[PDB]
Amino acid sequence: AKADYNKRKPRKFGKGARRCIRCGQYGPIIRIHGLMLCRHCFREVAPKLGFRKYE
Amino acid sequence: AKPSYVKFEVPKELAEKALQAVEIARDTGKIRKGTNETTKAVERGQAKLVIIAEDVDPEEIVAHLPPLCEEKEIPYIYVPSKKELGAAAGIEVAAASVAIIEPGKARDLVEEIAMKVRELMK
Amino acid sequence: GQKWKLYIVKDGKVIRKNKFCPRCGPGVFMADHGDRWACGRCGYTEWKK
Amino acid sequence: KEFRYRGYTLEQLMNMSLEELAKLLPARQRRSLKRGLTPEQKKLLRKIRLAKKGKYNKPIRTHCRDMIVLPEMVGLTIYVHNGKEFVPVEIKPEMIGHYLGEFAPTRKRVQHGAPGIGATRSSM
Amino acid sequence: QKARIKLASTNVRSLEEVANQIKQIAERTGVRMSGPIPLPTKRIRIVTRKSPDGEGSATFDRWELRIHKRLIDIEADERAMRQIMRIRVPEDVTIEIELI
Amino acid sequence: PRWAVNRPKDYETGRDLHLITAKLDMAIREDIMRLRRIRAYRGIRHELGLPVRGQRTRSNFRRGQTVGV
RNA sequence: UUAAUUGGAUUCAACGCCGGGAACCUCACCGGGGGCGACGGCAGGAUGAAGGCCAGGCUGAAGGUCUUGCCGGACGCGCCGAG
Ligand SMILES: [Mg+2]
Ligand SMILES: [Mg+2]
Ligand SMILES: [Mg+2]
Ligand SMILES: [Zn+2]
């Protein structure tokens, strides 16, 4: 076929297996407790999720 | 098939029943143009209304339908012209075999013309 | 062009030179490899004659 | 002054199962063989066996740098990709147990020039 | 014959309101209740670099989410069990009921 | 024990040997020479006097004289 | 230096910094091989457009393409705008 020359392989580990669910970036993904967010995206949506800066 | 093949005459009634009763059939049925597509269907009996215009030359790929007419019931009629047959059912090109299955509200005329062709020449 | 020939069909008799695949019905035709029945879509390692 | 690998001549190595040979190689080769060969290595091995049988009178070119040299490959010449071109390698008996990539360098040797501006503190 | 009730929330007031409702239900009948036991709080702490780029001094944020818990044990009585099954929690409180 | 000798599974005989003095020196020399004959990567590294076990060389391993600009 | 050794930052306030511990991916660099044009219009097209394949060459490997002929029925990048 022809569309086979456009599909990516289904990776199970490595940096290529995880993307931010809000912007699609590869790299600095926060994996704690199942979050999948960049360090950039988490900073601006943290107050809505209920986190606070106590100290 | 082709005009240079004298099978029988050209009654007006057969053309009336064959060209003017597929526009009422297209809107409530499925269309299968083309000789090669229809050939397998008519060999397998999938063809129901085999309308054959005399526009295809040479006597190479037209020389299959008549010798296969005895192999099946093959209710078939002949079409005078190719220009508007596609306009009757399909697309605006020249078609030679518009075979359709289960047309809607075209039973009495089709049965009568099929009987007439059966008793006319086979 | 046009591809419908090589079939022995006479004025009244229709018989196919190339058999159809046993998987499917009549009408689908094989190739003419001559060493094996190519079949196009099924393929057979039979050493046809 | 013949060749021996663990007390075996070349011919005794030739008539060995891949499992029996795997007990003589170092641990890395043994684990690689036990875990099976990749499909690309399968195609390369098929070509090699064909060439040995007397067919395939064409040069062998391959992208497989991680293929392990085997005794039945001795005497052939293989062209291994180094990144930009295929280099010839002539397989000798003392190569048994090595990866092909070890014989096709991927970097050029460095011959230094004169240090330029900013190479020292005083040049900035 | 005794049922165990677990509660959890990010808001400390709603937890106490639901617990007080349960305590009133139990007192409103003749039934023994093992008092609301406070279990250790869950803290989720996440530390991140602030700047989008890599230039400048490195400074950090320390975000925190706190989850509070309670535990109540009470003997299963049909007259009182239906009442504690009819009480509906605010949307930010999780409640689970099991039979031991 | 066999796992205590300094040349187990000899490359030529296949046995477990322990070498001392000159024999040890010439065995090591022969191993390096074999690596050099087949033009293997480690043989080239041995010839050029550069690190063999995959070290970085931009910063450390400097033995020479400062060049002028 | 190299085929390439991808880029940003240069006093404090650049240099275990870009959460930068890169085997593949990441990837932006180098050598090579493939794929893609909603919507309008031109050629063309059921006398079958576009599209898909058993075997075998080409190839690092590939119906990618060629050889060998079989499958599918309605749109059309061979041309112009536009995306
Ligand atoms: Mg740089
Ligand atoms: Mg690493
Ligand atoms: Mg990489
Ligand atoms: Zn993000």
Q: In b/e form, how buried is each residue of E11-46, taking b as 16+ CB within 10 angstroms?
A: eeebbeebbeebeebbeeeeeebeebeeeeeeeeeb
Number of domains in chain B: 1
> Given D6, D95, D123, which is nearest F38 (Cβ)?
D95
> Given B39, B61, B68, which is nearest C2 (Cβ)?
B61
Per-domain boundaries in chain E: 1-100
Distance A53 CA to ligand 4 centre (A): 21
Task: Check CB contact of D5 with chain F, cutoff 8 Å.
Answer: yes
Chain F hits for D10, Cβ within 8 Å: none
Q: Which two tokens stand for residue F24?
A: 């040890």
Number of domains in chain A: 1
How far off is chain F from D11, nearest CA to CA, in Å? 15
Whole-number Å distance between alpha carbons of E65 and E42: 8
Closest protein CA to C1' of nucleotide G22, residue? A15
Task: Check CB contact of A40 with chain E, cutoff 8 Å.
Answer: yes
Whole-number Å distance between alpha carbons of F28 and F7: 10
Contacts of B96 (CB under 8 A, 6+ apart): B33, B34, B35, B52, B53, B55, B56, B79, B82, B85
Residues E87, E21 contacting (CB under 8 angstroms):
yes
Distance A22 CA to ligand 3 centre (A): 25
Cis peptide before B58 (omega within 30 of 0): yes
Instruction: Tell me which residue range forms the domain holding A33.
Output: 1-55
Instruction: Tell me which residue range forms the domain holding B4.
Output: 1-122
Within 10 angstroms of residue A16's Cβ, the number of other Cβ atoms is 11
**∠ CA E8-E10-E15 to the nearest 5 degrees?**
50
Q: What are the helix (H) ranges across chain B?
A: 12-19, 23-26, 35-43, 65-69, 85-88, 108-120
Q: Find where tokens 């063809």 sit.
A: B47
SS (H, E, C) chain D: CCCCCCCCCHHHHHCCCHHHHHCCCCHHHHHHHHCCCCHHHHHHHHHHHHHHHCCCCCCEEECCCCCECCHHHCCCEEEEECCCCEEEEECCHHHCCCEHHHHCCCCCCCCCCCCCCCCCCCCC
Smallest-distance ligand from the CA of E52: 4
Whole-number Å distance between alpha carbons of D76 and D91: 6
**Chain G nucleotides with an atom closer than 7 Å to a protein C-beta:** 1-5, 8-9, 13-14, 17-20, 24-27, 30-31, 33-36, 45-48, 51-55, 58-62, 64, 68-71, 73-74
> Given C2, C9, C27, which is nearest B63 (Cβ)?
C9
Residues C4, C25 contacting (CB under 8 angstroms):
no
Q: Please give the single-letter amino acid code of residue D50.
A: L
Q: Helices B108-120 & B12-19, crossing angle to 10 degrees? A: 140
Whole-number Å distance between alpha carbons of E64 and C21: 69
Residues C20, B79 contacting (CB under 8 angstroms):
no
Strands E2-9, E93-99: pairing is antiparallel
Method of structure determination: cryo-EM
- Does the annotation list C44 as a binding residue? no
Contacts of D32 (CB under 8 A, 6+ apart): D68
The separation, in Å, between residue C7 CA and nucleotide G47 C1' comes to 19
Whole-number Å distance between alpha carbons of D7 and F9: 10
* D65: Cα separation from own chain's centroid: 7
Q: In b/e form, how buried is each residue of D54-67, taking b as 16+ CB within 10 angstroms?
A: eeeeeebebebbeb
Per-domain boundaries in chain D: 1-124
CA distance between the termini of chain D: 62
Q: With 0-12 CB in 10 A as exposed, 13-18 as middle and 19+ as buried, what is D104?
A: buried
Bridge partner residues of B97 (DSSP):
B52
Whole-number Cα distances in Å, B11 to B8, B55, B108, B114: 9, 17, 19, 14
Query: Rg (Cα) of chain B, in Å, rounded?
Result: 13
Strands B30-32, B99-101: pairing is antiparallel
- What DSSP designation does A52 have? B
User: Residue F34's closest CA among A27, D4, B118, B122?
Assistant: D4
Whole-number Å distance between alpha carbons of E31 and E72: 13
Whole-number Cα distances in Å, B4 to B13, B98, D28: 22, 21, 81
